[PDB]
């Protein structure tokens, strides 16, 4: 059945807060050629015990996880199921991603504006893979260029702003050149100094 | 160190804490929230339209949150009642696209380094609360096991109108007002 399936936590053998977390994490490289599952149990902020598919068994990361790791490794049916979760959870959900999330293409909005400092605002794009370059009369500028980190909007879009400190001349044209997987042709946008 | 891969997903960010008590069930793919499960209404709420085609049994969230409830009680007693350490959150405010007076925009408030995951993210327009135009994400995981959360405020841009993001947490001696000043805080 093609529905997302979850990784499962197992049972442990100014106000005050006590926090617990379980993360069923899947790592994919080269599609489903290389797949790794790392399930983590965290007490407050300390990871206490883990299942890494590259190890193939539970391992306490700290003292508080040793009772669980000892107990869960003694249960052969748990181990076999955990060893199979790379396919039933990671590889299974990856097949759903390939036709939905891994196909989301949002072309960026490229804008050039001052605040001399020239800012190329490359907003609302998906996926993250981007290349933004400045040019002054077809000459590539890098020495005087500073870029923000990649900015995660949260709504499944990214933005990034690339700034260029320039010495404005009369016969000068500044072009922001953006490359992104959702574009067949790279976007080139121009700015000309006026007064 | 961190694991190098092309893609990273959390096919279960499971959260349960004593305060409340509350829980959260989300799936994340490459750092973005795919859906959450409303534990009260027993309902899968998708954060991305293309995923609306799928199903996810809200009972999966409910059973896992109950496993985390037992594990929490178990580790509270095992740790000799060691409680979570309040972490000072880092607040950043920026717009979704370049600012145009006479062109609507969204103001984004990122609250980072959140721990424990109990936070109040309200918006102020010239000093007073805002209700309409507001929305927010769930608590999104970080590899250091703290969270972040992003809040939004859809607006009509004005030269007079000034906006602040008021964040409340136990790691702060008094709330935090982060003024939205468009003088390149993103570019430092």
């Amino acid at each position, epitope marked *: *059945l093609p529905y997302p399936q979850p990784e499962l936590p197992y049972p442990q053998p100014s106000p005050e807060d006590f926090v617990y977390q379980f993360k069923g994490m899947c790592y994919f490289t080269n599609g489903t050629e290389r797949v790794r599952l790392v399930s983590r149990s965290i007490y407050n902020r300390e990871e206490i015990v883990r299942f890494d598919s590259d190890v193939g068994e539970f391992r306490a990361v700290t003292l508080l996880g040793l009772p669980a790791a000892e107990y869960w490794n003694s249960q052969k049916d748990i181990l076999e199921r955990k060893r199979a979760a790379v396919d039933r959870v990671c590889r299974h959900n990856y097949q759903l991603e390939l036709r939905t999330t891994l196909q989301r293409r949002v072309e960026p909005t490229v804008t050039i504006s001052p605040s001399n400092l020239l800012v190329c605002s490359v907003t609302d794009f998906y996926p993250a893979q981007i290349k933004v370059r400045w040019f002054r009369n077809d000459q590539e500028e890098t020495a005087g260029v500073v870029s923000t980190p990649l900015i995660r909007n949260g709504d499944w879009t990214f933005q990034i702003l690339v700034m260029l400190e320039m010495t404005p001349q009369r016969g000068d044209v500044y072009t922001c050149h953006v490359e992104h997987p959702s574009l067949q042709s790279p976007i080139t946008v121009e700015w000309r100094a006026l007064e | 160190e961190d694991i190098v891969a092309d893609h990273v997903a959390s096919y279960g960010v499971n959260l349960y804490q004593s305060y409340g008590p509350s829980g959260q069930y989300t799936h994340e793919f490459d750092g973005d929230e795919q859906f959450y499960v409303d534990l009260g209404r027993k309902e899968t709420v998708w954060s991305l339209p293309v995923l609306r085609q799928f199903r996810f049994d809200p009972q999966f969230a409910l059973t896992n949150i109950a496993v985390l409830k037992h594990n929490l009680n178990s580790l509270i007693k095992r740790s000799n009642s060691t409680a979570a350490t309040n972490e000072v959150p880092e607040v950043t405010v920026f717009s979704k696209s370049p600012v145009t007076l006479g062109q609507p925009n969204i103001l984004i408030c990122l609250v980072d380094n959140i721990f424990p995951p109990v936070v109040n993210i309200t918006w102020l327009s010239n000093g007073h609360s805002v209700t309409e135009g507001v929305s927010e994400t769930s608590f999104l995981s970080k590899s250091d096991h703290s969270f972040f959360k992003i809040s939004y405020l859809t607006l009509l841009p004005s030269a007079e109108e000034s906006y602040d993001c008021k964040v409340e947490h136990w790691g702060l001696d008094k709330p935090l007002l982060k003024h939205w000043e468009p003088e390149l805080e993103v570019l430092f």
Partner: antibody
Amino acid sequence: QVQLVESGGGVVQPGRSLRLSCAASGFTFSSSYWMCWVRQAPGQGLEWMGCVYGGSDTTYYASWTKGRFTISRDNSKNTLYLQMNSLRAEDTAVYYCARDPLNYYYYGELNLWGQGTLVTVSS
Amino acid sequence: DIQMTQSPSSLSASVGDRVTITCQATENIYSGLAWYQQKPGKAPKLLIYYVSTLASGIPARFSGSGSGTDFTLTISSLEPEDFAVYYCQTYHDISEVTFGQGTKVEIKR
């Protein structure tokens, strides 16, 4: 290798209580499946009564139960129990306990049932 | 409380006969279907889950099909060991799991 052995079945007076036992062997109660109770009246079919999660307090009962049944599993003894309250002639059935994946077939298909214990409601 | 309606309530067939059992849900149960066999004096045995997944060991002559409300169990070429009562089971809502009535497969002489 793995099995569920039931006990405590027999005769019971109408209006009185009865606790059935279901001891697990070859495995210990854990996540990824449900520990359930299914009764079957003579010559009739299967009727699901309720499940307890293999790894938590998550207990569900069929609508028709009306709070008469209590499903619990003591981990120290590795035993699943069925408390039956306010019994009537309608309750006469062979009572089975099962290890049922249910919404967890994706994680593991192990389907295991007890031998069944006979419960008779009559004075 | 998803109600399952199993048809027929009983049937008669000989060895080699293609046998079809049918189960009907009062609503869409989205692949949450299992099929059990029950022989006299024995607890049920799982045959198929997820509508059509043959449980391990179960012979290739057994098969499942269907979607939403209509589902079938097909024994391609019947064998003497196949005379027993079959049940469908819905686990789409794990808080209200229900079994279909039952279908006794009987020998024709």
